[PDB]
């Protein structure tokens, strides 16, 4: 689809360099997202050691992101359209 793709938007996206090895995703405790492995081997007695909570053996084949935005409907009689009132944004699943 490289003949129909909008070149205007593609050229504005950042270019990413291919890394060295096959990367595996993981789950890490939050506020540990910026630490780097203070020790060679996990010491659970201490905290903020920068070790993943769970290491994926195999990367996911696909990842789905869902975001509903909470708007509210007000049905006023004898109106061609309902009133939509913004309620909130919602969490990404």
């Amino acid at each position: 689809s490289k003949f129909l793709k909008n070149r205007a938007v593609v050229n504005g996206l950042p270019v990413i360099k291919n890394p060295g090895k096959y990367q595996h995703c993981y789950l890490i405790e939050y506020e540990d997202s910026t630490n780097v492995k203070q020790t060679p081997t996990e010491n659970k007695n201490k905290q903020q050691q920068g070790f993943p909570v769970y290491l994926f053996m195999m990367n996911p084949e696909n990842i789905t992101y869902n975001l509903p935005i909470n708007y509210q409907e007000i049905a006023i009689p004898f109106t061609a359209k309902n009133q939509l009132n913004y309620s909130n944004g919602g969490n990404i699943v």
Partner: peptide, 29 residues
Amino acid sequence: IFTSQVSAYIPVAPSQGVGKLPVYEILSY
């Protein structure tokens, strides 16, 4: 949404002088 509740209603529509006095004393001054 802001909701309003209004409770309203309709009001219904539409002698010369006294007799006797105690005796006085008058003193010119």
